[PDB]
Design a protein around this ligand. Structure first.
Ligand SMILES: [Mg+2]
Ligand SMILES: [Mg+2]
Ligand SMILES: [Mg+2]
Ligand SMILES: [Mg+2]
Ligand SMILES: [Mg+2]
Ligand SMILES: [Mg+2]
Ligand SMILES: [Mg+2]
Ligand SMILES: [Mg+2]
Ligand SMILES: [Mg+2]
Ligand SMILES: [Mg+2]
Ligand SMILES: [Mg+2]
Ligand SMILES: [Mg+2]
Ligand SMILES: [Mg+2]
Ligand SMILES: [Mg+2]
Ligand SMILES: [Mg+2]
Ligand SMILES: [Mg+2]
Ligand SMILES: [Mg+2]
Ligand SMILES: [Mg+2]
Ligand SMILES: [Mg+2]
Ligand SMILES: [Mg+2]
Ligand SMILES: [Mg+2]
Ligand SMILES: [Mg+2]
Ligand SMILES: [Mg+2]
Ligand SMILES: [Mg+2]
Ligand SMILES: [Mg+2]
Ligand SMILES: [Mg+2]
Ligand SMILES: [Mg+2]
Ligand SMILES: [Mg+2]
Ligand SMILES: [Mg+2]
Ligand SMILES: [Mg+2]
Ligand SMILES: [Mg+2]
Ligand SMILES: [Mg+2]
Ligand SMILES: [Mg+2]
Ligand SMILES: [Mg+2]
Ligand SMILES: [Mg+2]
Ligand SMILES: [Mg+2]
Ligand SMILES: [Mg+2]
Ligand SMILES: [Mg+2]
Ligand SMILES: [Mg+2]
Ligand SMILES: [Mg+2]
Ligand SMILES: [Mg+2]
Ligand SMILES: [Mg+2]
Ligand SMILES: [Mg+2]
Ligand SMILES: [Mg+2]
Ligand SMILES: [Mg+2]
Ligand SMILES: [Mg+2]
Ligand SMILES: [Mg+2]
Ligand SMILES: [Mg+2]
Ligand SMILES: [Mg+2]
Ligand SMILES: [Mg+2]
Ligand SMILES: [Mg+2]
Ligand SMILES: [Mg+2]
Ligand SMILES: [Mg+2]
Ligand SMILES: [Mg+2]
Ligand SMILES: [Mg+2]
Ligand SMILES: [Mg+2]
Ligand SMILES: [Mg+2]
Ligand SMILES: [Mg+2]
Ligand SMILES: [Mg+2]
Ligand SMILES: [Mg+2]
Ligand SMILES: [Mg+2]
Ligand SMILES: [Mg+2]
Ligand SMILES: [Mg+2]
Ligand SMILES: [Mg+2]
Ligand SMILES: [Mg+2]
Ligand SMILES: [Mg+2]
Ligand SMILES: [Mg+2]
Ligand SMILES: [Zn+2]
Lengths: 95, 69, 60, 106
RNA sequence: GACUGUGUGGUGGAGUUGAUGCGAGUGAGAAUGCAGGCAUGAGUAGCGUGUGACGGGUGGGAAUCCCGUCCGCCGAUUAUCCAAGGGUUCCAGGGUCAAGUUUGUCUGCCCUGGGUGAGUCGGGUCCUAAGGCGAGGCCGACAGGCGUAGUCGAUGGGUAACCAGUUGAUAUUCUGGUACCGGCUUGUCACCGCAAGCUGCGGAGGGACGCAGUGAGGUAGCUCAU
RNA sequence: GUCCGAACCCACUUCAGUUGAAAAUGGAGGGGAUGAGUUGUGGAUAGGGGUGAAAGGCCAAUCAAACACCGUGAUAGCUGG
RNA sequence: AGUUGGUGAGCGAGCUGUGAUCCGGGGGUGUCCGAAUGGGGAAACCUGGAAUGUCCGGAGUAGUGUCCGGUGGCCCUGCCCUGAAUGUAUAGGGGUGUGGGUGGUAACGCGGGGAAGUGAAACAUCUUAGUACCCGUAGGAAGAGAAAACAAGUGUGAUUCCGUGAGUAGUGGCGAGCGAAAGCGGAGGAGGCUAAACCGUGUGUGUGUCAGGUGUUGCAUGUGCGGGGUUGUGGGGGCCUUGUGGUUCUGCUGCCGCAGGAUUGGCCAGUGAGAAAUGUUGCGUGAAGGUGAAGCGUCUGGGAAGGCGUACCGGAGUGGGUGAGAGUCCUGUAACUGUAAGCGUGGCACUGGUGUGGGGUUGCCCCGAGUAGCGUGGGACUCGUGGAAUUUCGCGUGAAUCUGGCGGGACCACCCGUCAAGCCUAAAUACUCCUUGGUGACCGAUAGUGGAUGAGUACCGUGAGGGAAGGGUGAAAA
């Protein structure tokens, strides 16, 4: 069957902000994930990609902001964010 | 820029290794884009076009559009 | 019923025409009877018209 | 859609506008909007701001040739020639192409 | 006469004049006519229950923003937390065209970025009520109506977690401590064996049920204290 | 289907409001307030039909036959232009 | 030779000419919903496979959670097994996917149901109008169609459509209104099968048939399949006078003759409706392209296409752009040209596929039945129940069959025409959601589409639904 599926299809990008950087102090990484991926799939994919033992994966759905511009109401995409808590010393290098 | 003519000379297993390598490169490019790196924003689209090329070669071998080595 | 399972006979539509000719819409239904039939060894009920009963088109 | 008869790097003479009679090398072409930038002709502003050439209509310039010591403006024609075109796989095959020639110089 | 000059300026910046014919979406003052723009009333009525005062700050600008001190007000609610509904209004920074019945440096407004974390909470993954749909089927000229087997459908039944701490914005969700529930696997003990067990399938028990009323034993709370 | 009386449901009188704070309310009193009570959630009945402790009442702020669209540019011995 | 769509640029690229972008053709991918189809559902969501080595294959884990792909909706239908109460059997049940279906679609078609406002100066017959709407169902068109016809004495000869006939004849509370047909002029221009008689062919079963020959030698009925047959001053079957294309030679009837049989003619006839459907060769094209003529100098101007001067092309002076008004600056235009490709399309040749009658006779036999008529209650016809022909629906009743049936406006007789109760048929006709090219004494932003812009949007409404307004700097953003 065509279309090899990759763990890297599920972890889109890291989330870099003040809250994420403060979470990195407690070995916790925030990623944007495919909106159709569950916590177990995300956990397995993170373990496969980063070679790290994962103690927890939490998820939230962040609705996209709505702004009125010319051409009317424009809508930013809805995203799913996975917050991954990692073993005591394992570390993830997101660069 | 990969060429479909070159990929048509490769075999199936190395073509799929190429698919996985391109997926890994796209992953790294997206992470660099998120973190403020990636001066080279054209490779971000070109790697996906390369993935499409390899999939086209693999599927034309699967569907017998071109003879499969 | 008003539809024959044999020959597909269905009601007609016409007028009540009184002495004053004030027409009203009305129906003519076929004389449908529900009878027991045994066709190819199968026993069942059928709504058949008396015209197909008289013609012998139904196996009782 | 196809291209224009004026290409980048051509030597043209302006036949209409403020700089009528000027001769310059075509620096860049805009095939969609039929406007070309001719070297040293339409000097205006852009955007501590660069002052540079501006595009004029491609119909305001004409290709120029030196016949007997003077620059004279000519129209162009096309003649079909046999060439060998190459496919993406590297295979070669015979085909035809159009080569531009200047009139007034045969 | 409807009108008009081939007079003469100004503005304007791409069409149009006369003769003779041809064709009209060819003429407006009114239809409580339709659309737009603008008057009159008129700088007039109102500015939507109410208690604010002062000191300092910010700022181009302050009664109306921020801080403080007095004083007053609600307190079975002018408090705190949810459901429904709304949908980013939340937080931080920048802003003062518009909005705010005034001003505004302010804002539930504008722009940019950020923010919502669950095995146990509320739903699904469980169960059914009313009701809906409904294989076959029955009824009906056609369209369609009803309904069996079933399948949905909470406003109900069932189901395992608490306290403390932390942010600008989340917290029975994160963190610390201490628990519980269902799986998977594993060390170990004990027992089975027409005749182990597992799953289906049902029987029965159970779930399982009204209203009103009094008393007893407690506990939360509250009050006082040498 | 007891009595007085809050919440709650209602709406008897009066004053105000009447370009309202509000296309039915506010102030002051007033009736019921364990019952034929009130209320949340979902559901059923649909237009010559529904529902009605019955007023031609109500059926999404004008119901002696809702609303929308279509027949349709209905028709008007009438008014206006 | 530039290019990474637009509103609306610079980054980083690729083409860096190893020809990209681009254009035509064909493919690949194609999340989720939607007939929506594994199950559920508030569309774009949720949720799955009893127990087992797990629904099947693969990936991953120690294992379970997990991931990727597949399969399984329902209805009809075909094929196979089993056959309830119960006996035959059938209903039902169990395997297989054999085929078809489901839903959408602007107009046009066919069949069916069917208003009212309105007009009648009221209103009920009537009109509106078989309109609006609704239901079922197509096709590229549909429907009709090859005389149970018209005509009127000679004749025409399937259907459909247009023009006349004609607002006539009629019809009508003889009110308001409605309203033919024959004939004639045209567009188009096919005709084809079948039922049955009779002949070859099994099961509710044989005691009679010169090579032959047996209580049957092929004897009896009524299915299916093949021949035959297909017409109306009747035809066909049967009985015969004869004729098949040249045969290698197998049967039955009379060692006459009839038929299966075969590379090789063929008058024929073909992809058609025609009782049917299978390849290689032969032209020009739409989808893309290609070539495509011929002007300079001065003046004024921001700018020349304008003025002045003087030259060219024209199978091209239709247009439109360009800084003002261009035949010769651009785009093009006339003319020619290419078309690889199409599912290409049309047509021809060959291959390959299928295949005759004429004269005589009426002994006999067939020629479409619950059909036609009749009565009754309705409908369409000029015809509104009448003198009511013709045609059609419901309910009853119910033929003849060629020395017969039907029609020619009640009905009967003669005459004329015709042969119903089976089927299929092109073109002329209708329409335009769409695609390509073009046109206008059509509009020009209150117009023309509701919509020149985020337009079926904002907004309003629970909902069905309703529904706007907003264009212009400049030659160039300079
Ligand atoms: Mg969660
Ligand atoms: Mg009888
Ligand atoms: Mg190419
Ligand atoms: Mg060219
Ligand atoms: Mg004139
Ligand atoms: Mg007018
Ligand atoms: Mg006026
Ligand atoms: Mg007026
Ligand atoms: Mg004023
Ligand atoms: Mg004053
Ligand atoms: Mg006054
Ligand atoms: Mg006053
Ligand atoms: Mg005042
Ligand atoms: Mg204060
Ligand atoms: Mg107080
Ligand atoms: Mg929310
Ligand atoms: Mg915001
Ligand atoms: Mg807002
Ligand atoms: Mg805020
Ligand atoms: Mg702020
Ligand atoms: Mg203000
Ligand atoms: Mg502020
Ligand atoms: Mg139920
Ligand atoms: Mg059904
Ligand atoms: Mg449920
Ligand atoms: Mg609940
Ligand atoms: Mg908070
Ligand atoms: Mg807590
Ligand atoms: Mg915790
Ligand atoms: Mg039980
Ligand atoms: Mg019990
Ligand atoms: Mg009970
Ligand atoms: Mg006590
Ligand atoms: Mg104390
Ligand atoms: Mg009481
Ligand atoms: Mg009382
Ligand atoms: Mg009341
Ligand atoms: Mg309801
Ligand atoms: Mg009354
Ligand atoms: Mg109301
Ligand atoms: Mg009324
Ligand atoms: Mg009425
Ligand atoms: Mg009408
Ligand atoms: Mg589904
Ligand atoms: Mg479904
Ligand atoms: Mg299983
Ligand atoms: Mg009627
Ligand atoms: Mg009427
Ligand atoms: Mg009238
Ligand atoms: Mg009248
Ligand atoms: Mg079709
Ligand atoms: Mg037809
Ligand atoms: Mg004629
Ligand atoms: Mg036969
Ligand atoms: Mg040319
Ligand atoms: Mg000139
Ligand atoms: Mg009539
Ligand atoms: Mg009759
Ligand atoms: Mg007759
Ligand atoms: Mg007669
Ligand atoms: Mg016949
Ligand atoms: Mg036909
Ligand atoms: Mg056409
Ligand atoms: Mg306007
Ligand atoms: Mg308009
Ligand atoms: Mg204007
Ligand atoms: Mg709404
Ligand atoms: Zn019948």
């Amino acid at each position: 069957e065509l279309k090899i599926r990759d763990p890297r299809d599920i972890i889109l990008a890291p989330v870099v902000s003040e809250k994420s950087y403060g979470l990195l102090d407690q070995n916790t990484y925030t990623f944007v994930v495919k909106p159709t991926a569950n916590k177990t799939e995300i956990k397995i994919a993170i373990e496969q990609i980063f070679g790290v033992k994962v103690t927890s994966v939490n998820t939230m759905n962040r609705k996209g902001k709505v702004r009125r511009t010319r051409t009317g109401v424009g809508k930013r995409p809805d995203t799913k964010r996975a917050i991954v808590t990692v073993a005591e010393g394992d570390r993830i290098d997101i660069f | 820029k990969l060429s479909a003519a070159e990929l048509r000379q490769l075999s199936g297993e190395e073509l799929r290794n190429k698919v996985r390598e391109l997926k890994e490169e796209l992953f790294g490019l997206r992470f660099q884009s998120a973190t403020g790196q990636l001066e080279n924003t054209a490779r971000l689209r070109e790697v996906r076009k390369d993935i499409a090329r390899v999939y086209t070669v693999l599927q034309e071998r699967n569907l017998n559009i071109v003879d499969d080595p | 019923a008003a539809v024959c399972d044999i020959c597909a006979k269905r009601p007609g539509f016409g007028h009540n025409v009184p002495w004053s000719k004030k027409k009203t819409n009305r129906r003519w239904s076929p004389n449908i009877q529900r009878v027991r039939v045994v066709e190819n060894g199968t026993h069942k009920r059928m709504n058949v018209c008396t015209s197909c009963l008289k013609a012998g088109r139904v196996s009782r | 859609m196809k291209s224009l008869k004026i290409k980048k790097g051509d030597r043209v003479k302006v036949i209409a506008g403020n700089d009528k009679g000027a001769i310059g090398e075509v620096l860049s072409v805009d095939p969609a909007r039929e406007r070309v930038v001719v070297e040293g002709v339409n000097i205006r502003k852009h955007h501590g701001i660069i002052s540079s050439e501006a595009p004029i209509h491609v119909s305001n310039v004409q290709l120029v040739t030196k016949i007997d010591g003077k620059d004279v403006v000519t129209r162009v024609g096309y003649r079909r020639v046999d060439v060998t075109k190459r496919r993406p796989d590297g295979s070669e095959y015979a085909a035809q192409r159009s080569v531009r020639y200047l009139k007034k110089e045969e």
